[PDB]
Amino acid sequence: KTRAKAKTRSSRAGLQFPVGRVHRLLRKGNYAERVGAGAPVYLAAVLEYLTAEILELAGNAARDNKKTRIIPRHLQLAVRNDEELNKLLGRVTIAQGGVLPNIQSVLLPKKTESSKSAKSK
Amino acid sequence: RAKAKTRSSRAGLQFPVGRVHRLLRKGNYAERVGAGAPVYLAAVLEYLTAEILELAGNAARDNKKTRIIPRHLQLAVRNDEELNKLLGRVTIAQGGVLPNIQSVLLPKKTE
Amino acid sequence: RRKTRKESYAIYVYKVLKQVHPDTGISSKAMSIMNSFVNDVFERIAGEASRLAHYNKRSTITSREIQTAVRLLLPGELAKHAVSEGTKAVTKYTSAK
Amino acid sequence: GKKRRKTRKESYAIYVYKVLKQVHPDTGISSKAMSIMNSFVNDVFERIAGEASRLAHYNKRSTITSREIQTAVRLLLPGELAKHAVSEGTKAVTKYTSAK
Amino acid sequence: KKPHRYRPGTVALREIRRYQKSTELLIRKLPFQRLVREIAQDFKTDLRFQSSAVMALQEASEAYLVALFEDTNLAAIHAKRVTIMPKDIQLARRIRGERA
Amino acid sequence: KPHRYRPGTVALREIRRYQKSTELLIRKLPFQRLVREIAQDFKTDLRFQSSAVMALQEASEAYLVALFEDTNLAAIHAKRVTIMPKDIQLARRIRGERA
Amino acid sequence: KVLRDNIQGITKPAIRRLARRGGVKRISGLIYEETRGVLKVFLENVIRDAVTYTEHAKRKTVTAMDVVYALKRQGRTLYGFGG
Amino acid sequence: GKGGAKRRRKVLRDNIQGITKPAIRRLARRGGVKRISGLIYEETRGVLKVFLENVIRDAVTYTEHAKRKTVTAMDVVYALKRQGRTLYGFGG
DNA sequence: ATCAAAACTGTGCCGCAGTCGGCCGACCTGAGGGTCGCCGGGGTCTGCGGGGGGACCCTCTGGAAAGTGAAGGATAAGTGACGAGCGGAGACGGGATGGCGAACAGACACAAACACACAAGAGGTGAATGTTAGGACTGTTGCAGAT
DNA sequence: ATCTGCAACAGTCCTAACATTCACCTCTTGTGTGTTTGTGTCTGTTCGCCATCCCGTCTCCGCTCGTCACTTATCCTTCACTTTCCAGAGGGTCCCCCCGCAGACCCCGGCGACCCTCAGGTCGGCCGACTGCGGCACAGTTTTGAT
Ligand SMILES: [Cl-]
Ligand SMILES: [Cl-]
Ligand SMILES: [Cl-]
Ligand SMILES: [Cl-]
Ligand SMILES: [Mg+2]
Secondary structure, X not given: OOOOOXXXXXXXXXXXXOHHHHXXXXXXXXXXXXXXXXXXXXXXXHHHHHHHHHHHHHHOOOOOOOOOEEOHHHHHHHHHHOHHHHHHOOOEEEOOOOOOOOOOOOOOOOOOOOOOOOOOO | OOOOOOHHHHHOOOOOHHHHHHHHHHOOOOOEEOOHHHHHHHHHHHHHHHHHHHHHHHHXXXXXXXXXXXXXXXXXXXXXXXXXXXXXXXXXXXXXXXXXXXXHHOOOOOO | OXXXXXXXXXXXXXXXXXXXXXXXXXXXXXXXXXXXHHHHHHHHHHHHHHHHXXXXXXXXXXXXXXXXXXXXXXXXXXXXXXXXXXXXXXHHHHOOO | XXXXXXXXXXXXXXXXXXXXXXXXXXXXXXXXXXXXHHHHHHHHHHHHHHHHHHHHHHOOOOEEOHXXXXXXXXXXXXXXXXXXXXXXXXXXXXXXXXXX | OOOOOOOOXXXXXXXXXXXXXXXXXXXXXXXXXXXXXXXXXXXXXXXXXXXXXXXXXHHHHHHHXXXXXXXXXXXXXXXXXXXXXXXXXXXXXHHHOOOO | OOOOOOOOHHHHHHHXXXXXXXXXXOOHHHHHHHHHHHHHOOOOOOEEOHHHHHHHHHHHHHHHHHHHHHHXXXXXXXXXXXXXXXXXXXXXXXXXXXX | OOOOOHHHOOOHHHHHHHXXXXXXXXXXXXXXXXXXXXXXXXXXXXXXXXXXHHHHOOOOEXXXXXXXXXXXXXXOEEEOOOO | OOOOOOOOOOOOOOHHHHOOHHHHHHHHHHOOOOEEOOOHHHHHHHHHHHHHHHHHHHHHHHHHHOOOOEEXXXXXXXXXXXXXXXXXXXXX
């Protein structure tokens, strides 16, 4: 009996991401001679978390705009709408994500009335 | 043990080929590090070092000086298109800027 | 024969997708994007961690190095929470079995 | 002072100096200038080693060889700089794998 | 009747709204693919691509131009104008460091 | 004997003067109190080696000088020679510092 | 007609469009040409690098990765092909 | 009296005001600025504060990680380098 | 202040796929187990240099005055894009070969890793020995602003 | 158009500071020499998919036109910002006191590397395949544009 096997480090962690693949990648990416035990658990955790944050906002993407499948465009609306992710990915370009609806309030007319506003923003 | 021949002499470089090999090892860029690798890189660094030095030396000389200072490195580098791009995101402590005044700010030669 | 199989993060992303939106499905291109994102973040953190290690002349990338990296690489609360998740996961792992 | 053995710190100083002498025999360099030259060498070294390292990964190779240093140099240095540099590198590899 | 021509700018203003809500490339693919092949000719003669690469390249370049146009816009407006001229595709490139 | 240069003759005189020199332009002690204040308000038991404050000042002054360059451009682009907040803001924006 | 296009294939309309996704209302006449140049230099830098990756790899075909890596070190990182 | 009083930690406030009008004016000159708007000084004060804060934050982070209580030029150097404002002249 | 001609909008129904949940298959890989160099956490001694502060010199800041010339508002004149109607060109969808070339794949020279004595290249010290920028101190020259 | 007066440039002694040349002393560390895993080279096979003439449908690019609104050149009025004068606040330099603590050592437990099987977690096909969702058409609000 070569003893009862099982238990993935991802589980002993309660993590949805591959702790062991990650420890593998760290060891093989010439990042450092030796990689610690905690290291991959920590990295996988951070990775799962950020994935979650995007997806989360990426889901509410097809809801405030209808649809049930997450396409690039949602991811983009998600990221560029959240200050923090936007910075983290301020030098990244999501394919087929388009831009955000913005239109300099000096190009669009209205020279009549409506609701003359200039004491808010 | 036939005397001892520095990998640098074997290559005709001034920069330390051996040390470059070592730095490449310990900097973990990869498992193995080829034999030419340190030789080639040590050559490049030497070339780039001489270009900087040649121009800085000329600069020091134009300002009647004999000792290159940071200001001379700045002048050398910023007056050369290519080196300037290479060091586009670099600050040379104590080098100043290149004297340069936008034309529109010059005394209107008409009054 | 058969392709050497490309490892991806697609299974784990999809999984997570659920814990936050079972009522939502993910596109094909949109999933590579997420795959890209994770690799990026991964290398940025590993990279900084690599450097942290070398600056203090250490040969090991520990959980400490990953934490410090996160503090340097992630914006405010994004870093706050990531650090939260990090330590949490590491202890639940250290103790729990 | 007292016996403590001031830790040893190395730099490219002496080499930078040799090269300076070669191009401008009668010219010296201040310590801050030299400190700057040392930084430039290090910077470039990491800049190249790093692009090299990456190259080998993209190509599942586990060795950093002259072919990575050269591609690196080519992706990194601007215009004529690369040519001269690729030229000077190759030149030494040869003089090296040949002579002794 | 008359061509019912709207007020100069209202169509544009609307074009903006449509294109800002869109997500598909605006350069017509085939002509773009030609440009790419043309450029590459000057680096390595006779070499094949990979449909996606061209898409990647086109994807990247369009994201770049739109972004630049955003900047150029801000620049025109800064000058108190509303028409983007070249003098401001340049001030944007200059300040970004793409022209130093 | 009352003498007076016309507005902008000393300014240009100075531009010429400061672009020729390399000395730091913010005074040393004041700059250091600011660095010590900003840090302290992050972490409390810190001490700075002198060279670290010097690096910080070199990087800071180089950063502002370059920013004033771009600012000056912005002003000139607007057909002006007087720099203004709206100019620093366009610079920072296009640079990707603000938005 | 002997390449009476190519670097000139990118048309005044496409440009106006990119510029509208950009938020541009009124567009001057010499823009289309300025733009055409800019796009050119951009591609010259990206492709120069891509191909450099291709040649190092000893191939004759440019891949998505070669392009992706290029854009990466150009600081214009792209997601959606490089995985 | 004579020997050792004690000396108290100095309390720092309003130091951004040490970045005087004239110093800011001198920086603007090295940048080739002929005429400076009156509202330019508090702006500059603001931009520098933000700039210092980002660098300092990162450096302090490198200082803590190493279990030190003293900030070194290298910490400043690595913080500058990771912000894409590499600096030459203080090691590194 | 109230009417007309266009141009987005979700519904609505429906073929073209596009993601799915397996169904297993084929593996490749992460884990359970156990041996093993050597890295990193501890405890210590401890010089160096940071924070505070006095003392003195003198430079640089801050504030008020006067004057101009730069900014910006108001207006006029010349035309540069925009909106459009509209005719075809070549861009685009739909297919079918023809083969270069990229992705494996098995096999094995050598190339680079280690292991180790062993010298001397390189670094840290004090030190004459100079050479050299940096601070007054004065003249020459260029030039801006006053008659 | 000459004239005066202030600013920037050069020279010249002058002494402190920074360098360079010794030459000596440790000593990390690169090189010389010999074995020893295994990675990159090279040869050989499969088919993925890139290059490409081919061929209807027409969307979309070009162009000439009409003319409006945006840009720019002027002319004016207002006042914001540059120059200057000058007292004296406080930075700079030197020198000191008091310690905090960076960093060189040394000693040695763990920790993470490196092995070796093995079960299964992960990937690539196919397979319906459930629904997913753009692809045309309708009538309904939502506007710009004029009376
Ligand atoms: Cl760890
Ligand atoms: Cl090699
Ligand atoms: Cl223009
Ligand atoms: Cl303003
Ligand atoms: Mg405080």
